[PDB]
Design a protein around this ligand. Sequence first.
Ligand SMILES: O[C@@H]1[C@@H](O)[C@H](O[C@@H]2CO[C@@H](O)[C@H](O)[C@H]2O)OC[C@H]1O
Length: 329
Amino acid sequence: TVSLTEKYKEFFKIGAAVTVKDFEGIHGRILTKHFNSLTPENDMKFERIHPKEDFYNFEATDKIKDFALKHNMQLRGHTLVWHNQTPEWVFRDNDKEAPKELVIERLREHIKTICTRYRDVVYSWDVVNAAVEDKTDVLLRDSKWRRIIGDDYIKIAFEIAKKYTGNGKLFYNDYNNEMPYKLEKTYKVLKSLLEEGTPIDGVGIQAHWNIWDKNLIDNLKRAIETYASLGLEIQITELDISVFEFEDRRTDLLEPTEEMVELQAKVYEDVFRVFREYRDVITSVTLWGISDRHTWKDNFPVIGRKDWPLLFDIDGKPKKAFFRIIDFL
Ligand SMILES: O[C@@H]1[C@@H](O)[C@H](O[C@@H]2CO[C@@H](O)[C@H](O)[C@H]2O)OC[C@H]1O
């Protein structure tokens, strides 16, 4: 039995999204065998770790840190600034909206507190997540963070984080950012940030992909080269490979089709080949889950319907895909 993280030890870290339930049972053994990086799937998000101004919730993340230290793993810090899973208190000032400097002060305190607690075990932080506008042609998503703080908010977040993160690298994280439209936009944003002295080390390519994307391998190569040209590290942060196109909302499938499993094995083999080709600029590859038993894809984009997006099947066994990505020299 070949260990994924050992097989890729000269290439990049190998990670998984986790919650505390993953430290038990068969997920626990998969993690210790195959993974040397952990990302809290939810527990370090603002709403979860800091639900009220005067209340932090550290128990779950403390457990994730403790497990990591006990098993010679390190964490990715996901995520400080995001338009989702952020509580309303941050943007409120009694019965008014909070002004720019009040939100900044709250953010400073949030980042100070979280980063101080976990900087010893976190090797990479998703400082800002999904700030690039995904649909319209404007550069930046118009979230409450962007609206209230203004366009400098990204730089402001990175400068604050840099005070408290030590050896930890600082990442900008996003989805669809291998696709040509978003890649161009993201390039412009990051280029501008770097020319303003923003201490950004790397770009996170979330890699929420599917088996039917014909442009994926070409897009991904374009993307890695483009981001690397800015002097940034690349991490693959949330890899999973759905058996459905985004807009296929069918709910009838009880198991994937044979075509689905073979295609999946192929796409996994192909993307990991690309990851090895660009190993000079890629420092970590994380999967958004461990086995098909627990995946956010079971409820997104369709509530209550099963998907099979990962490297271990619903019983915890390595899939054909797993053996394809460890088959190399
Ligand atoms: O449990 C779910 C998470 O897995 C999900 O994670 C998000 C997926 O989209 C990405 O763009 C984000 O970076 C990542 O945090 O969040 C929702 C939650 O219900």
